């Protein structure tokens, strides 16, 4: 199902041009506050699928109050997902539909626009430094955080024995270790998201946030391993699929 190389080459070019717009520092007052005072609304996006369907998916956007993490907005919608999944090109599959949900939120409940969006996928921890979380952030201009559930093995990062030893060393929720690429760059952080979970999240900057702020906020959104905004978008979009054929 993989697109031809000329197509991937065009997509690489687009990623490299948009990357110039990524802001990888704090631009919002709440981000420099020790307790995120001023942060009121946190967004989460995800896309679920039907096992049989190569065409149909369900895209969900949720907004949660902060710090209580209660759902104040949900839009789950069937969409005609086209492009296949190709590692490093996730945005070309999911991000056009996620942009449409943000625009629907602006049109329907503009006062509930999230101040930051947690994205199910990497940001700058990416083959070309421009993952789905950056891509969504640049297209919507919202602050975004990339949260991935396994390690993207790029710029020398490997899920080898040493990497797994560092995971064992993470002992409680909040513990972290930096992901340092062969380039000298800190690409992201491995984060132990709560006390009763050993498999880390991999957190990276999407847009308009610093890495250390992205980690700390992500930690604060974790009732469970998956940060509550992504988890609710994940749960609600699968439930929606289940309600309509299943």
> Per the annotation, where are the binding residues?
46, 120
CB 117 within 8 A of CB 146: no
Nearer to Mn ion, 170 or 234 (CB): 234
Nearer to Mn ion, 7 or 40 (CB): 40
Nearer to Mn ion, 2 or 149 (CB): 149
Crossing angle for the helix pair 132-140 and 91-108, to the nearest 10 degrees: 40
Total of residues contacting Mn ion (CB under 5 A): 4
From the CB of 30, what's the least distance to Mn ion, in Å? 8
From the CB of 238, what's the least distance to Mn ion, in Å? 7
Q: Is 228 in the site for Mn ion (CB under 5 A)?
A: no
* CA 22 – CA 47 distance, rounded (Å): 23
* CA 178 – CA 170 distance, rounded (Å): 12
Which residues 108-137 are close enough to bind Mn ion by CB under 5 A? Answer: 120
* CA 73 – CA 112 distance, rounded (Å): 7
For the chain, count helices (H), then strands (E): 6, 8
From the CB of 54, what's the least distance to Mn ion, in Å? 17
Q: Is 75 in the site for Mn ion (CB under 5 A)?
A: no
Edge-to-edge order in the sheet of strand 144-148: 71-80, 56-65, 41-49, 116-120, 144-148, 201-207, 186-191, 176-180
Q: Which residue is nearest to Mn ion (CB)?
A: 120
Residue among 19, 23, 37, 201 nearest 115 (CA): 37
Q: Is 46 in the site for Mn ion (CB under 5 A)?
A: yes
Q: Is 234 in the site for Mn ion (CB under 5 A)?
A: yes
Residue among 205, 230, 225 nearest 60 (CA): 230
Nearer to Mn ion, 75 or 234 (CB): 234
Site string for Mn ion, 160-189 (x = CB under 5 A): ------------------------------
Residues that bind Mn ion (CB under 5 A): 40, 46, 120, 234
């Amino acid at each position: 199902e993989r697109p031809p190389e000329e197509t991937l080459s065009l997509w690489k070019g687009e990623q490299a041009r948009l990357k110039a717009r990524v802001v990888d520092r704090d631009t919002e007052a709440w981000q420099r506050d020790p307790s995120f005072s001023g942060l009121q609304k946190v967004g989460g996006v995800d896309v679920s699928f039907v096992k049989g369907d190569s065409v149909r998916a369900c895209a969900s956007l949720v907004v949660l109050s902060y710090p209580e993490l209660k759902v104040v907005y949900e839009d789950s919608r069937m969409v005609g997902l086209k492009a296949p999944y190709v590692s490093g090109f996730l945005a070309f599959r999911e991000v056009p539909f996620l942009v449409e949900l943000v625009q629907r939120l602006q049109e329907k409940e503009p006062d509930l626009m999230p101040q930051v969006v947690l994205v199910d996928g990497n940001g700058v921890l990416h083959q070309r430094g421009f993952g789905v979380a950056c891509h969504l952030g640049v297209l919507t201009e919202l602050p975004c955080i990339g949260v991935a559930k396994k390690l993207l093995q790029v710029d020398g990062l490997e899920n080898n024995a040493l990497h797994k030893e560092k995971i064992v060393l993470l002992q409680a929720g909040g513990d972290t270790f930096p992901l340092i690429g062969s380039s000298g760059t800190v690409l992201g952080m491995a984060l132990r998201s709560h006390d009763h979970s050993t498999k880390p999240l991999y957190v990276s900057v999407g847009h308009r946030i610093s890495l250390e702020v992205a980690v700390r906020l992500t930690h604060h959104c974790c009732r469970f391993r998956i940060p509550e905004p992504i988890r609710q978008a994940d749960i609600r979009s699968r439930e929606y699929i289940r309600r309509t054929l299943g």
